[PDB]
Paper text:
In contrast to our single-particle map, our subtomogram averages of the dimer did not suggest the presence of an E-site tRNA, lacking density for the acceptor arm of the tRNA molecule. Superimposing the Alphafold2 prediction of S. lophii MDF1 matched the density and was corroborated by our mass spectrometry data. In this position, MDF1 would mimic an E-site tRNA, as previously suggested. When comparing our single-particle structure with the subtomogram average, we find that the L1 stalk, when bound to the proposed MDF1 protein, is closed even further than when tRNA bound. This indicates that the proposed MDF1 would hold the L1 stalk in a conformation that is incompatible with tRNA binding. Close inspection of the 100S density in comparison with the 70S model revealed that the ribosomes within the hibernating dimer are in their rotated state, in contrast to the unrotated 70S ribosome. In addition, the beaks of the dimer-borne ribosomes are bent towards the large ribosomal subunit, in a similar way to the structure of the MDF1-bound 70S ribosome isolated from E. cuniculi. Our cryoET data, combined with mass spectrometry, provide evidence of the presence of the hibernation factor MDF1 in the ribosome dimer, which is exchanged by a likely deacetylated E-site tRNA in the purified ribosome. In contrast, neither our ribosome dimer structure, nor that of the monomer reveal the presence of a factor that blocks the polypeptide exit tunnel, as is the case for P. locustae and V. necatrix.
The ribosome is the central protein production hub of the cell and conserved throughout evolution. By combining cryo-electron tomography (cryoET) with subtomogram averaging and single-particle cryoEM, we investigated the structure of eukaryotic hibernating ribosome dimers in the microsporidian species Spraguea lophii. We show that microsporidian spores contain hibernating ribosomes that are locked in a dimeric (100S) state, which is formed by a unique dimerization mechanism involving the beak region.
Author numbering:
A (entry chain SJ0): 2 to 169
B (entry chain SE0): 2 to 261
C (entry chain SL0): 79 to 155
D (entry chain SX0): 72 to 140
E (entry chain SI0): 2 to 168
Write the structure that this text describes.
RNA sequence: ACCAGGUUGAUUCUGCCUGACGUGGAUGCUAGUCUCAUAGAUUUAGCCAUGCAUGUGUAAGCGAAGCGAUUAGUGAAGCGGCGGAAGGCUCAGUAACGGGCGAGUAUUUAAUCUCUAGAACCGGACAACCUCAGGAAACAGAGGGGAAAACGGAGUAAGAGCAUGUGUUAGCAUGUGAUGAGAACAACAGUGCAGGAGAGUAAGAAGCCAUCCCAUCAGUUAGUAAGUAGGGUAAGGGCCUAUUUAGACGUAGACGGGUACGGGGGAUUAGGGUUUGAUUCCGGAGAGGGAGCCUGAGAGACGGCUACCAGGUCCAAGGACAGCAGCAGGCGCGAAAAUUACCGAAGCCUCCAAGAGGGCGGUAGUGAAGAGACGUGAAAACAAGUGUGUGUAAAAACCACAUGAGUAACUGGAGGUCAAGGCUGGUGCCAGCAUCCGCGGUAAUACCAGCUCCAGGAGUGUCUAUGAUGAUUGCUGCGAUUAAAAGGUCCGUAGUCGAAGAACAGUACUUGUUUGUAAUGUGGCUUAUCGAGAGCCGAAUAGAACGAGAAGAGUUCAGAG
RNA sequence: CGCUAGUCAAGAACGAAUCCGAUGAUCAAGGACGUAGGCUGGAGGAUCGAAGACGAUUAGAGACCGUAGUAGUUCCAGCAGUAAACGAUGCCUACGCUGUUGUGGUUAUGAGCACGGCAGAAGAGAAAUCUAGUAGGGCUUUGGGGAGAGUACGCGCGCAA
RNA sequence: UGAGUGCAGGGUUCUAGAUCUGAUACAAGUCGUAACAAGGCAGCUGUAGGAGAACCUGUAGCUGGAUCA
């Protein structure tokens, strides 16, 4: 049926391709994700930014290039993903940095997720018990609880994250 | 259809009214009256949105049953009465006065004025005719009619009206170097000064304009109202004086020019 | 009289054009009676309906051209 | 019922023929080729049985459910 | 009843067309009014938008204008002499626009006699008026407007129409 | 922007079958929590029990009975006024004024706006009231009063058309004239109604351009093509009729037949494409099938009337009534689709209204059609429960605090394609399995089971249409010596295609400026714990108006051949 | 299309300082020719020989072989419209390596132009081989896994086949 | 202006039918052996006769022939 809402995953063309199976298995294992759908969701997000960079570099006009480059780079800096010293009002560096985006990887999006941040900031003994503190309300940000492990943490929120003891 | 249309679906109503798509299926169908349906707004949208003084239909009723609201000097009692551009709105209790103008985006907006500006409006001249008993007449854009005005006023000019006497006060014509306001098109709500006019036969005349902060733009005469005797404007315009910026210009102005 | 008008239509898939034509029946007045004939080009103006098929009237014409009935030199030169 | 033709259908499972009586109602299904075509080694048969008396034949054969009676 | 729509009509190429609607009132027609000569009888018809139209069934008289001398008179109508569309409307004496009619000439005779040049300007009219012949043409539409009005035939118009009457 | 298995004793090719992946319906087995959408379209535009979906009164049109009164009052039966032509449902018919873009006439328009703008007398009835009183019912009679801003007449303003001057063209002058009216009331301090001229809204008719398959359908048409004159209409017109002229349309597909609600849009997609559109917006048509119609500003109306045909219902047998492609609901038909639920609240529409009405619309209930976010433990310490408050029209859910606690996985597979066992027991070309290739004749990693593994996971298998696979439909981009494939040879019309040199012109061609897109989609930003969601911004297709450039295309010339 | 003379029209190629100036390429519909065998009418009839009849050979031969024998095989006036009608390679127009051998004209005797054969090479192609090399030049015909099937129904031509 | 309904015809789509005649599948039935080797008369295309049946015979053609001589 045709109805509201987008679809956020793309199914792989070959269901039993051995190099894909092994490399996916590793990354789910290491990062403590629920199933293959969590991973595929991040992959589509990553692809979208790569497409924008491609389009910008090949555009003929200057007005669009100067306008939309800035927006793309600023956004990815705020998420804490693309960390480099982009200088504005300088055409060459904008081109240089756009080229550096083109080999961005899903690992970089994964490491901004709250489940990984909690463990990485040494507030939990494993990526597993980090998830188990996001459930059951033990994790709090700016004085308010966050129930969802997929919460992507912007650059500089790290000062305000906290854990509290269990209710028992 | 067997007869005249009564309803109006919310997705079909003018983009100038600026009403939220999701809340309900209908919108108010303006009553017949002074301006066209595409160039005016019903009064009940003004009181609930543009200038918030009611929040429910029971309150909208009460305000007009008590006879509070005055438009062009007459008290109004139809909630679906159309108001248009250059159209003084007032509440005599608390002595408030407003004109109706466009945002730079082309939406409608109310602008607060003094009791001086509240005394006059502007319209455009559409036809001249002589009537039974050899009486000369003249007519205007918003369905206005005038008896024994100055004969020299020509079709296409713009005239200033005294609201208390309902007579014409001043006249201005379409010439190089006069101030213009933009009613319809790509550049609604812009304000500028005439560079040059190119005359066409049996078809609209093309007018070329310079903006106050340098930009040239041209449009057809059918979308322009002339809003001053020569140099400078009659009516007081908005908090921002009708300058429109591209997203590109907004970026340059925010983060600085691209250096060599 | 019957007037033919001709034009080209673009077919997007094959990136090429086809020739098309339409027939229009027009009113010719007695003031043009001897002057307009087959092959000539004509200008017509629009009006309210004159009959079941007729809506245009001939208003003037451009005569199918001759540059010159070419010169013959005198035998004396 | 829908055409008043009489057709041949195949009965899939191990003991499947025992789950059907004369004058039972059955629902019938396609073999999965592009046109209606024979599949495997069965000559000239073009459909297969799916349900008997409103219940799944797979459940009947494997004794997970019983006849409506 | 009667219709003015082109529902039933063929295409210009000769082919038939199919019907896509039942009939609509906004293309209704009405039966002809056949105005006869006789004592006045006129009917009032309620028309679209609530307007009224006046339909003459019988008429006795008309206003008739003299164009050269600029006066108008009111006179009886005798009979139709000629009708351009159909020979039948003449023999049954039915009134329409462009019918040519015989009238009482005496009022016109009394007026035109005052001009001392009258005989010299139009001898054939003068002769007709002596012989008791007086001919006029109807300009109004009786079935629409509810009355008949016209002008007296003079000069070359007489010369033209009299050739249509003669056996 | 991608491949794999299958003709042979092996090999290299042509070629088709099958697998692997989106999406629309149907269905097996299994199912913890919360949020956003959507549901008798496909078959029968089949048939329908019941209840509801359209009515409205003020200080201010007329006011009967009753009640009551020092000649007051009341409180209203009917009449009048305004609406019932919108919205809701469906896709039968239509290859067409059905669809897109421009333009504003040859037209009519209750309400509403601006300017302007009204000295008028007389008479009956109809309904309700009162007295009889019919009929099985549905529905009606006699007789007698009496109102209007209801109705008909009188005068009187006004006044269509026709003719001539003068200003196209209003207007004015003059002659002639059919027709022929008109509302006030209340003071809580206002509300109405007659005439004009211009607007505003809505139709009717028109201009240009685009529109499906069959040649085993090649000729079609005679109101047909045109002219003159008249009738008719709100209005142009063969719209209709009389006499004259023979036209009009076709291989660049006429005419006939079959099929179809049309767009904005949807699905797939590197690009070029291929498929669909009953279905939130716009426009069209219908109300069992056909046809006629009164009233009105507006209907060829069906929750109006009238007749036939097909079907029904009640009767006292004489007659009456009725039409769910509105909302619930029932029966059928099918492989196929929810509650005879609440609603002085939100968005709007209707009236004579500081109020009344609305199944239009909103709120929940039901269902693994679709789309988000999360449970099923951690190493010290875990959903779903419950109670208060909130929330709403009233609710439930959601959220806040406080109490208990310790519950929570299945579907398809394991010989190759294709991820994962020559494990143990039965069966012996049987019973079965297998999209394809192939297994089983007593030593079956392939059947039937046990046990371990694999894949996706609140989900997974199957059937059926379609897009991709596919350069196996080829514009980009395939083939024709031998695999399928160059007409036995010429002539020839329509069709498609056509020198050098010197000049010329602007309709195609390309491009500027201006128009042309609500939703959807596209580039963004901001707020619901997050993410779909919601709100605001910017640019945009095809199509049209006016300019510009002249290479290619086009037209002409001859001290060129 | 193969004996010799005489006669009657038109065509191809070659040589060269002739004339006209875009008159042209390809082709649904429509028209003309088309070995052999066959058919309608006339002439004729040597040789050969379908059908038919015998003799042998064989299990059986109706066939192959031998004897005999008819329609046809020839000519004139027509109908018909098919072939492994094949170099199984459409028609115009291009760009393209060498050696050798022909046929007809012309020649500074060095060579050319038209129509051919042959042998290598380089490229090409699944190979065999090359009318197949290079290529978005123009126009027509035509194929889309085997079978059923070039069959059924309708239609057009023909005396029939 | 016209619903309905008489009587003849057409145009479409389905369906019945004694009997005849195609095709396809027939584990392996009966009679021969026509093709693939010079397949025991080299094969094949057109046309015309004949015949239980494959097929045989005359006439013109082709090599995809058993010969590039």
């Amino acid at each position: 049926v045709k109805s509201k809402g987008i679809k956020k995953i793309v199914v792989p063309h070959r269901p039993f391709e051995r190099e894909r199976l092994v490399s996916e298995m590793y990354i789910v294992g290491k990062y403590g994700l629920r199933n293959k759908r969590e991973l595929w969701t991040i992959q589509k997000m990553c692809d979208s930014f790569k497409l924008r960079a491609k389009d910008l570099l090949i555009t003929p006009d200057e007005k669009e290039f100067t306008l939309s480059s800035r927006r793309l780079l600023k956004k990815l800096a705020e998420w804490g993903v693309f960390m480099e010293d982009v200088d504005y009002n300088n055409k060459q560096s904008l081109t240089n940095n756009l080229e550096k985006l083109l080999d961005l990887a899903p690992t970089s999006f994964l490491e901004r997720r709250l489940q990984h941040r909690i463990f990485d900031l040494g507030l939990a003994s494993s990526v597993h018990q980090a998830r188990a503190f996001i459930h059951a309300r033990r994790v709090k940000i700016n004085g308010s609880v966050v129930n969802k492990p997929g919460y992507l943490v912007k650059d500089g929120e790290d000062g305000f994250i906290e854990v509290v003891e269990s209710k028992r | 259809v067997r007869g005249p249309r009564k309803h109006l679906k919310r997705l079909n109503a003018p983009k100038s009214w600026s009403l939220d798509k999701n809340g309900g299926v209908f919108a108010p169908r303006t009553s017949t009256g002074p301006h066209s349906m595409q160039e005016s707004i019903p009064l009940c949208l003004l009181l609930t949105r543009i200038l918030k003084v009611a929040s429910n239909n029971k309150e909208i009723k009460h305000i007009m049953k008590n006879r509070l609201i005055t438009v062009n000097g007459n008290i109004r009692t139809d909630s679906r009465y159309p108001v248009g551009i250059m159209d003084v709105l007032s509440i005599k209790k608390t002595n408030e006065h407003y004109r109706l103008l466009y945002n730079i985006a082309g939406k409608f907006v109310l602008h607060k004025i003094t009791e001086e500006e509240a005394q006059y409006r502007i319209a455009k001249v559409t036809n001249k005719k002589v009537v039974k008993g050899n009486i000369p007449h003249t007519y205007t854009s918003c369905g206005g009619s005038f008896k024994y005005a100055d004969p020299s006023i020509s079709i296409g000019d713009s005239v200033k009206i005294d609201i208390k006497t309902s007579k014409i006060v001043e006249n201005s014509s379409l010439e190089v170097g006069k101030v213009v306001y933009l009613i319809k098109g790509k550049n609604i709500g812009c304000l500028g000064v005439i560079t040059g006019i190119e005359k066409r036969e049996g078809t609209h005349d093309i007018v070329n304009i310079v903006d106050k902060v340098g930009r040239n733009f041209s449009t057809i005469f059918s979308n322009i109202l002339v809003v001053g005797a020569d140099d400078n404007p009659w009516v007081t315009f908005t908090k921002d004086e009708g300058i429109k910026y591209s997203e590109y210009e907004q970026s340059i102005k925010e983060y600085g020019p691209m250096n060599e | 009289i019957v007037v033919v008008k001709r034009y080209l239509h673009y077919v997007k898939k094959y990136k090429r054009y086809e020739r098309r034509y339409k027939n229009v029946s027009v009113h010719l007045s007695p003031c043009f009676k001897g002057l307009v004939n087959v092959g000539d080009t004509v200008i017509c103006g629009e009006t309210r309906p004159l009959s079941k098929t007729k809506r245009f009237v001939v208003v003037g014409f451009e005569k199918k051209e001759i540059k010159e009935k070419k010169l013959k030199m005198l035998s004396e030169i | 019922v829908r055409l008043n033709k009489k057709v041949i259908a195949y009965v899939p499972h191990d003991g499947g023929l025992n789950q059907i009586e004369i004058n039972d109602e059955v629902i019938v299904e396609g073999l999965g080729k592009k046109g209606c075509r024979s599949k495997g080694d069965i000559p000239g048969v073009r459909f297969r049985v799916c349900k008997v008396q409103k219940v799944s034949l797979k459940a009947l054969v494997t004794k997970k459910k019983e006849r409506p009676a | 009843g009667i219709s003015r729509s082109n529902r039933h009509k063929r295409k210009e190429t000769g082919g038939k067309k199919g019907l896509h609607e039942k009939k609509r009132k906004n293309n209704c027609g009405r039966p002809p009014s056949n105005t006869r000569i006789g004592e006045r009888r006129v009917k009032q018809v309620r028309v679209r938008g609530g307007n009224i139209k006046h339909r003459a069934l019988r008429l006795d008289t008309g206003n008739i204008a003299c164009k050269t001398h600029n006066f108008t008179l009111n006179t009886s109508i005798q009979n139709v002499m000629y009708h351009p569309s159909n020979n039948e409307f003449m023999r049954t004496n039915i009134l329409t626009k462009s019918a040519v009619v015989k009238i009482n000439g005496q009022p016109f005779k009394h007026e035109l006699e005052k001009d001392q040049q009258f005989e010299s300007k139009d001898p054939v009219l003068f002769d007709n008026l002596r012989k008791g012949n007086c001919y006029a043409i109807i300009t109004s539409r009786p079935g629409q407007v509810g009355m008949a009005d016209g002008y007296l035939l003079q000069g070359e118009e007489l010369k033209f129409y009299m050739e249509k009457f003669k056996k």
